[PDB]
Swiss-Prot record, chains A, B:
HAMAP family: Azoreductase_type1 (MF_01216). Homodimer. Quinone reductase that provides resistance to thiol-specific stress caused by electrophilic quinones. This is FMN-dependent NADH:quinone oxidoreductase.
Length: 207, 207
């Protein structure tokens, strides 16, 4: 019932194949699951106030490990700490997650790594046990929508990373939708885009 | 001759294992090579102003590709484009590169990814061809100094990624110094840090 949308592309559907496939997935998803809550997290939007692990955050977390009151932190630390935590709890609230990004230099875009930093939290999404770390979520589903220049066989670093992280925190069902290969064969744009658009709609009906 | 230092950690040597190893290495390197130019890029410092690939940047490149004059872009787009290029030229100008970062969630810090984005540039560090993409750089050397919570047999995503990018652009010599396992074995802190320190000084002497 709650679908979190992580939009990890700075542009809109008109400029982006990742975002276009996201939008056709979501139209199909909404029509198929009219009662589901759909929450959008646009990690590039200025309004989102995306936290970044930085000096103030690392030190806020030390200051709290030590035992300062959340009120001994600067206004700007308390804000970052609380914003970071909002993002973790948002993930925890979601039954399903859809992530949309382009492949940029064989890794996730910077703001997508920043979002991943919020979902890997000891005592929140995973825990330390005598047998090693163990997930703290179960029953979540994820869909990774990503556009690549070339054809990777789901074997690119970015999609493997997203899957490993999601698997670590207990998201065992990870689907992919990859819009690939148009940069290599621009003359197959209509055909590849059509294939991707129909796969997006179909995920809308089954995810 | 010219050593570029990429420090990708928000904290100082007093609070960071990878920064402490970096500083040991640098002290030993300057002693060994007093004539070499040592330029520091601290990706987290206030002064740095490193762009990330975002809407303003992408739309700037888009406008330039459409034939618009640099001077027609917004003042901040012009700043962003120029800074991004300055970063790429800095890498091209270095004979040797040392990168120092902690491992955060099996991957590099967000701003280190932002720095990799400035070094993997069609027409400056690699090129597309009929045979495949090919490097545009020759003769460089790299040292990757990274601290990890557990023991990765150089097999972690972050250091594999860093090695992948460097090799792709023509840097065939990529050395590693990994300060690992202290989070698992705090009682071994003294020994593990001393070992790392000796390797960092030895790299200063031989790199
Ligand atoms: C900064 C930059 C880096 C890129 N790096 C890669 C790369 O690692 N591998 C690849 O196959 N394509 C790469 N591409 C090409 C895009 O992945 C391809 O254009 C993609 O279809 C864009 O998705 P989008 O339309 O949602 O932006 C890169 C493109 C840009 C702008
Ligand atoms: C945000 C965060 C994420 C981390 N993620 C990992 C992880 O993916 N794997 C791991 O082994 N250690 C992880 N650690 C532990 C650090 O890699 C480890 O403490 C390392 O020695 C820190 O290096 P530094 O002293 O230079 O900061 C993480 C620590 C933090 C602060």
């Amino acid at each position: 019932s709650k679908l979190l949308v992580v939009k990890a592309h700075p542009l809109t559907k008109e400029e982006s194949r990742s975002v276009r496939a996201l939008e056709t997935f979501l139209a199909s998803y909404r029509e198929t699951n009219p009662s589901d809550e759909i929450e959008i997290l646009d990690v590039y939007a200025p309004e989102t106030n995306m936290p970044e692990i930085d000096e103030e955050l690392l030190s806020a977390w030390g200051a709290l490990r030590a035992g300062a009151a959340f009120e001994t932190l600067s206004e700007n630390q308390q804000q970052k700490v609380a914003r970071f935590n909002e993002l973790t709890d948002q993930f925890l609230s979601a039954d399903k997650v859809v992530i949309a990004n382009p492949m940029w230099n064989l890794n996730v875009p910077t703001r997508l790594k920043a979002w991943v930093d919020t979902i890997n939290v000891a005592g929140k999404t995973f825990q330390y046990t005598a047998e090693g770390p163990k997930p703290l979520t179960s029953g979540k589903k994820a869909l990774h929508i990503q556009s690549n220049g070339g054809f990777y066989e789901g074997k690119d670093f970015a999609s493997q990373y997203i899957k490993a992280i999601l698997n670590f925190i207990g998201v065992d069902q990870v689907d992919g939708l990859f819009i690939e290969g148009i940069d290599h064969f621009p003359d197959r744009a209509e055909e590849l885009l059509n294939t991707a658009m129909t796969k997006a709609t179909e995920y809308g009906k089954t995810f």
